[PDB]
Nucleic acid binder design. Structure first.
Lengths: 1082, 265
RNA sequence: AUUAAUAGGGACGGUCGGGGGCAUCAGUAUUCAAUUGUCAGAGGUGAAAUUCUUGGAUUUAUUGAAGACUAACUACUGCGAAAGCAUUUGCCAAGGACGUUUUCAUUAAUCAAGAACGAAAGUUAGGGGAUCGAAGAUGAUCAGAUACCGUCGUAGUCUUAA
């Protein structure tokens, strides 16, 4: 009851957001009274032939919008005239479904044609359609004479158009430009002309029957023929269906809200776009759902139900009851709906009384694409925790082609004129091919979608071939939509191929096919022709035999990036060039790992990372069964290489990368004899690792040994990290753990006073995220990436886009990886993340509108259908509202990143300064705004890795002694270590510890941020960096006489002290005197 | 009809013992793709209905199971099963489940539902054995029903032997092997030729297979058995009834001469 | 406010029972099937007969499937309204005895009428079969119904001995 009532308050208020006033409909219907009066004086002329029609209109202003093919005098026997038609109302304003929209809409003022003006043979040879193209220009010829005489044409204009973006019915449009003034309502009047109800035979105008006899089945040509008669009877159904349901219009408004979010409307989809089923068909489906819906005409939706029940059930019927390849929908307007379990390889919504397909407007490419969003939106009505009203319609899903899809390429279609298509394309395009798909915009639209269907197949989730630059408008003094754009004579500039790829098959090299035999089978005939020399005989691993094709792997593009150029080369256009230059340079921003087949390694190739997990498992294999005084029970690494969170891919013998040694947290048996002192705690566990080193030194000469202290724990200086590098070249930093670590931390908090309790708590969080909650996040890090491996391709590069802009020095990699993993578990309203370009652009838009004060981060570590419950996630909401009492603007608690394991929100994002977080969002605001304004290009694509380092009182440019890019395992290498292992650190990043002391001493007056990965972020040499630093706001004013100001300040008077920048610039300069190259002082 | 969230709930104040409203409400709740309000409805109608109404209470467990048959889970339909096995009878919900699994297109679990109910209600009840008999011969497993029918003679006492072995015969005469169904009638009439309760149910079913060669042969030999006058004249009335339906009035003519001469003594 | 029947209901808490409903797990004993070693008998009887038996009857051992019950411990032992009641353990509800300066103050005693639990039992052949009527043959019903709505009619309903 809370899933409906909280939705109903989100439905009733949202319908009030788009509340159309009665003032806007007043002058719009009163202008129709000036339209109905002026049309009532439109007289009928005399009947004339086809030849006399072109004689009267060639010297007149009005011209006939004749569709292809135009009429010819050698085949024209009948006559043509104009008549006084019966105008009526249809659509949204006839069912009271209209609402306020800023972009505007069309008011479907229907004009029914006279029945006596059409012959019995009107349905064939385009006879009645030749009457409608002549009478619509004739009615525009009479009304423009009438509207000029009423002097309204100063702000009113007339032009040509088409109904529902279908070119088979010429129509005129009336609007208002900037008593009868409807320019304040912004409603356009579509002067639609329809034929009389079954004036031709509806049984002869079914889908399987043809009306171009010169036959093959014309499902789309009969769709424009038969549905021209159903404008009155089907509207009479939804007129009475509005009276039987209290929330028919309210749920169709939310149906109009949900369908407009993903690009679905009454625009046609066979012409190379997405659509064909929108507000018109959903209100028709709501009439079929409120009049039955079962397989034996049982009920699917209720009549007395509200908007919360009718909106969710219809789209779930659009998701769970198939209509494309498995079944079909039935309807009857003249008696229940009963779903037919046989499909026709397309969308087919059967009108049994009217014999026309109500789902004929959508093609096979646009039918299944809405169903993947339908099951996504119906699952949002099934969730019992999250609010899903804003996730449906108030979040625009149709903004960018790189957002809702995985990849979109610009394949220019320089096809030229229609008669030159014998040499332009490989296809034979004649009159019989142009019988049902007569418009040339539709003919290559499904052909290239089918040619890509053998190319990709199951490598994507859908197919969308988009016609970019194609409009629907024309002048009434012109013939149709003609253009000289793109060097061609088509109804588009070019075409773009868009698809959402599934990562488990999008980069497969072995293009699978059917089995071989003694004779070439019919299933093997098509695949052999489609590949040719690319098709060869290749056997399986278990002994099976089939015809298959091997592809080429690359580190900049997937396997389908060649096949989108391959399958478009053969059967689409020999001169068309398809290329995806956005995701090509995006993969070049990642680190190129020094391994074999590095340029031949796709983004899905994670074999190099798991091969480093083999050596550490071989390293732990000598550790686990070894006898010590204390036996081992836990041998696990919490490093970034085993969690796929390292910015550098794990290459052997790589000493220069900061993520070289994958961190290890190990545990011994339960022991009360551990000492209860902090210095004695790490003194004892290092002794058990000393004998474990003495077991590794005795009979394990393949692996090396060295010791180092980990100073990442504040106030703990007794800890020791065991560094063991194996014979292959992979090293691990081994640290022990027991039950005394959190014992010494919590006893340090309660015993200490109210003064020093905070810093020993944050240093306890340093012992929590590294020892207590280290393996807990490391278990779910490798686990849930098995549902979307593109998170491991993105979050390694999203930090690489963050490390280039001087952000790595203040935030940990876990909170950076959980930021890019928010569009994986909660990808709404977009699709599943499946590429590095899709993953980075999802993080670019989500971190832009990430207001850290009002909404915190609670991302479920759950695989595809382990998450926190409704009572548990509301407890995570309790951490936000109580912390915002003393930290309301995000100055003391900004990034609340929480999950099921750590609902405190401040695990990896506590102790960080707020001002770097303000630029972390500002670099997410300006980078995403540049994509929609200036477009997406490689000038802007590498610009996100280009920081200007402005707003800086300090900017230090430096250069190190040894360039260490090749030493870190980055192929622009690492083969062996030295004889003594102490000399291996001479090729490390010297600015890592040089900036580590920078934030250490001068924390109270300087804000030190720098790069920790200098090998990839140095350019060519792999040793260059830059540090941006800002002064504090409290030390920007004069501070009085005190001892503990902790600021490197000078004398300004006998009473005040101020931080003089002269010694402040030299203090970081005299430390890094060997690295002293340049320093900017303002 | 009741088609709103407020509509069917108001009828519960007027009709507390009516689970038929919640039987349409669970069809009205789960039709909107949210069966959690439909699983709430079968839970609510259990605590709203009167406990003296057993026709709606056992059907309430049959409603939540049949909803679980298409739209449920693996252990959720079984946790509702053992809840009905404590609040109500065991095998009567399982014989409901055997008919439900007959519609659920799960023949493997229905084979398991026939065997797991055979441990509980196979030894004492002769009812579900013929329910396994009709389900086997409809799937054309005629010897499989004949295999456990001998186990069904080893299942219960001597009173259920004349009851169950008759029940396998008319189940086979309908949809199975009627020659072994008549051999069961040949067995039940050779077991007791003085009990006409097996031969008459044979003579009703043999004249339901419309074989005048088979029926009048069992009619002529039954009059020469241990039968009294009422089983002589009225069994002739079944003979004149069978000879009427066939199409030869010669056998209808001498059937009154065969019975009246036998009474002449 | 006359007392709180060493009347009674009701309430707490410590107990206990082979109590009953459901469930849990454990135990020997039995039958049938798959199958090896081997047979002049095996079973039964006062002596026999009968029964199966180089169709291996019969003994041993193993596995599967199915049905029953808690011997010795174990009894003049408790419990259940009575009938009845025994492995380990639970769920739900019932109960002997217990103590309250706990609560009510007769709410209390026997029961016609009238209703609830419930110990044993359905076999052989003779006649009658008027009535009824399972077995089955049947037209409707609900989505589906071998049930509720209508019919013929078998065994039986009446009696005869074991």
């Amino acid at each position: 009851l809370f899933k409906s009532n909280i939705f109903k308050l989100q439905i009733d208020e949202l319908l009030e957001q788009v509340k159309l006033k009665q003032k806007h409909v007043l002058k719009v219907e009163k202008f129709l009274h000036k339209l109905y009066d002026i049309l009532q004086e439109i007289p009928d002329w005399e009947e004339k032939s086809l030849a006399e029609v072109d004689s009267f209109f060639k010297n007149k202003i009005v011209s006939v919008p004749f569709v292809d093919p135009k009429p010819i005098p050698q085949n024209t026997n009948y006559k043509f005239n104009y008549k006084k038609p019966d105008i009526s109302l249809i659509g949204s304003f006839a069912l009271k479904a209209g609402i306020y929209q800023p972009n505007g809409s069309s008011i479907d003022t229907l004009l029914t044609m006279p029945k006596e003006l059409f012959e019995k043979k009107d349905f064939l040879n385009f006879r009645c359609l030749h009457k409608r193209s002549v009478y619509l220009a004739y009615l525009t010829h009479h009304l423009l004479i009438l509207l000029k005489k009423d002097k309204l044409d100063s702000f009113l204009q007339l032009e040509y158009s088409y109904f529902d973006n279908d070119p088979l019915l010429p129509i005129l449009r009336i609007s208002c430009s900037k008593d009868y003034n409807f320019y304040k309502t912004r409603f356009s009047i579509n002067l639609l002309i329809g034929f009389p109800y079954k004036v031709f035979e509806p049984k002869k105008l079914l889908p399987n029957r043809n009306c171009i006899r010169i036959l093959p089945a014309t499902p789309l040509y009969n769709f424009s023929v038969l549905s021209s008669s159903t404008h009155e009877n089907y509207l009479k159904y939804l007129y009475k269906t509005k009276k039987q349901t209290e929330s028919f219009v309210e749920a169709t408004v939310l149906g109009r809200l949900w369908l407009q979010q993903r690009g679905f409307s009454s625009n046609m989809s066979h012409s190379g776009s997405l659509g064909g089923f929108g507000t018109f068909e959903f209100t028709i489906l709501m009439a079929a759902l409120l009049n039955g819906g079962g397989i034996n005409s049982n009920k699917i939706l209720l009549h007395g139900f509200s908007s919360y029940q009718l909106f969710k059930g219809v789209i779930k019927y659009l998701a769970t009851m198939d209509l494309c390849h498995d079944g079909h929908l039935q309807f009857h307007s003249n008696p229940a709906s009963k779903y037919i379990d046989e499909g026709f390889q397309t969308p087919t919504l059967f009108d049994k009384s009217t014999k026309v397909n109500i789902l004929t407007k959508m093609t096979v490419s646009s039918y299944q694409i809405l169903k993947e969003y339908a099951g996504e939106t119906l699952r949002m009505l099934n969730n019992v925790v999250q609010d899903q009203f804003s996730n449906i319609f108030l979040t625009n899903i149709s903004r960018f082609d790189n957002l809702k899809y995985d990849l979109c390429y610009d394949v220019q279609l320089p096809l030229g004129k229609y008669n030159n298509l014998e040499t332009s394309l490989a296809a034979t395009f004649g009159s019989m091919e142009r019988v049902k798909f007569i418009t040339l915009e539709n003919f290559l639209a499904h052909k290239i979608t089918n040619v890509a269907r053998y190319a990709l197949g199951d490598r994507i989730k859908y197919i969308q071939i988009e016609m970019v630059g194609q409009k629907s408008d024309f002048p009434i003094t012109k013939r149709k939509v003609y253009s000289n754009t793109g060097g061609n004579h088509f109804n588009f500039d070019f075409v773009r191929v868009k698809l959402i790829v599934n990562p488990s098959e999008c980069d497969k090299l072995v293009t699978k096919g059917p089995a071989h035999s003694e004779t070439m089978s019919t299933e093997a005939a098509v695949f052999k022709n489609f590949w040719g020399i690319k098709s060869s005989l290749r056997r399986f691993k278990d002994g099976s035999i089939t015809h298959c094709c091997v592809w080429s792997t690359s580190s900049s593009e997937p396997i389908i990036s060649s096949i989108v150029n391959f399958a478009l080369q053969k059967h689409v256009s020999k001169k068309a060039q398809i290329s995806n230059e956005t995701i090509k340079k995006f993969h070049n921003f990642l680190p190129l790992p020094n391994l074999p087949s590095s340029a031949k390694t796709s983004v899905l190739n994670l074999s190099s990372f798991f091969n480093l997990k083999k050596s550490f498992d071989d390293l732990y294999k000598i550790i686990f069964q070894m006898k010590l005084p204390l036996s081992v029970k836990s041998i696990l690494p919490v490093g970034s290489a085993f969690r796929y969170t390292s910015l550098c891919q794990p290459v052997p013998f790589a000493y220069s990368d900061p993520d070289f040694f994958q961190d290890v947290i190990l545990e011994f048996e339960t022991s009360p004899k551990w000492p209860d002192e902090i210095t004695s705690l790490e003194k004892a566990k290092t002794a058990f690792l000393l004998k474990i080193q003495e077991e590794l030194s005795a009979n394990s000469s393949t692996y090396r040994s060295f010791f180092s202290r980990d100073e990442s724990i504040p106030y703990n200086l007794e800890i020791v990290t065991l560094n063991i590098l194996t014979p292959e070249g992979y090293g691990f930093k081994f640290r022990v753990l027991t039950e005394r670590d959190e014992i010494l931390y919590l006893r340090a908090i309660a015993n200490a006073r109210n003064e020093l309790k905070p810093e020993l708590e944050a240093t306890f969080l340093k012992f929590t995220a590294k020892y207590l909650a280290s393996v807990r996040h490391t278990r779910t890090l490798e686990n849930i990436s098995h549902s979307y491996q593109f998170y491991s391709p993105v979050v390694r590069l999203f930090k690489r886009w963050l490390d280039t802009h001087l952000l790595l020095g203040h935030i940990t990699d876990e909170l950076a990886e959980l930021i890019a993993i928010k569009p994986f578990v909660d990808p709404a309203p977009y699709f599943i993340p499946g590429s590095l370009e899709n993953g980075f652009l999802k993080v670019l838009k989500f971190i832009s509108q990430w207001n850290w004060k009002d909404d915190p981060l609670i991302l479920d570590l759950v695989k595809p259908e382990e998450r926190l419950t409704l009572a548990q996630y509301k407890g995570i909401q309790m951490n936000f509202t109580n912390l915002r009492n003393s930290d309301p603007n995000g100055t003391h608690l900004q990034f609340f990143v929480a999950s099921k394991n750590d609902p405190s929100g401040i695990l990896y994002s506590s102790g960080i300064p707020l001002p770097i977080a303000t630029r972390l969002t500002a670099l997410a605001k300006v980078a995403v705004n540049l994509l929609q304004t200036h477009g997406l290009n490689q000038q802007t694509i590498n610009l996100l890795f280009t920081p200007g380092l402005k707003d800086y009182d300090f900017v230090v440019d430096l250069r190190t002694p040894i360039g260490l890019k090749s030493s870190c395992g980055i192929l622009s290498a690492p083969s062996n270590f030295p004889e003594n292992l102490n000399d291996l650190s001479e090729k490390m990043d010297p600015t890592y510890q040089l900036v580590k002391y920078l934030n250490l001493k001068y924390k109270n007056s300087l804000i030190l941020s720098s790069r920790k990965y200098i090998g990839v972020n140095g350019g060519e040499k792999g040793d260059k960096n830059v540090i941006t630093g800002l002064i504090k706001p409290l030390f920007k004013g004069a501070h009085k006489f005190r001892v503990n100001l902790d600021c490197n300040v000078k004398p300004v008077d006998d009473e005040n002290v101020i931080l003089n920048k002269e010694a402040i610039f030299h203090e970081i300069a005299a430390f890094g005197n060997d690295m002293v190259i340049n320093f900017e002082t303002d | 009809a009741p088609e709103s969230v407020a509509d069917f709930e108001r009828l519960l104040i007027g009709n507390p013992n009516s689970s038929v409203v919640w039987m349409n409400y669970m069809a009205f709740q789960l039709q909107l793709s949210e069966i959690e309000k439909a699983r709430e409805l079968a839970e609510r109608a259990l605590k709203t209905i009167n406990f003296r109404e057993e026709a709606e209470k056992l059907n309430i467990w049959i409603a939540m199971l049949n909803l679980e048959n298409t739209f449920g889970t693996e252990e959720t339909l079984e946790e509702v099963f053992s809840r009905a096995c404590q609040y109500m009878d065991s095998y009567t919900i399982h014989t409901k489940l055997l008919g439900i699994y007959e519609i659920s297109e799960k023949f493997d679990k229905a084979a398991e539902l026939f065997k797991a109910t055979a441990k509980k209600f196979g030894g004492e009840k002769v009812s579900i054995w013929v329910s396994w008999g009709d389900f086997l011969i409809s799937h054309n497993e005629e010897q499989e029903a004949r295999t456990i029918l001998g186990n069904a003679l080893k299942a219960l006492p001597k009173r259920n032997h004349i009851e169950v072995v008759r029940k396998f015969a008319q189940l086979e005469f309908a949809k199975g092997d009627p020659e072994r169904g008549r051999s069961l009638f040949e067995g039940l009439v050779a077991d007791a030729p003085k009990r006409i309760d097996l031969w008459n149910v044979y003579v009703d079913q043999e004249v339901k297979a419309k074989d005048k060669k088979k029926v009048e042969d069992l009619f002529e030999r039954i009059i020469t058995k241990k039968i009294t006058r009422k089983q002589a004249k009225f069994f002739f009335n079944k003979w004149l009834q069978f000879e009427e339906s066939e199409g030869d009035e010669k056998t209808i003519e001498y059937v009154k001469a065969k019975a009246t001469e036998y009474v002449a003594s």
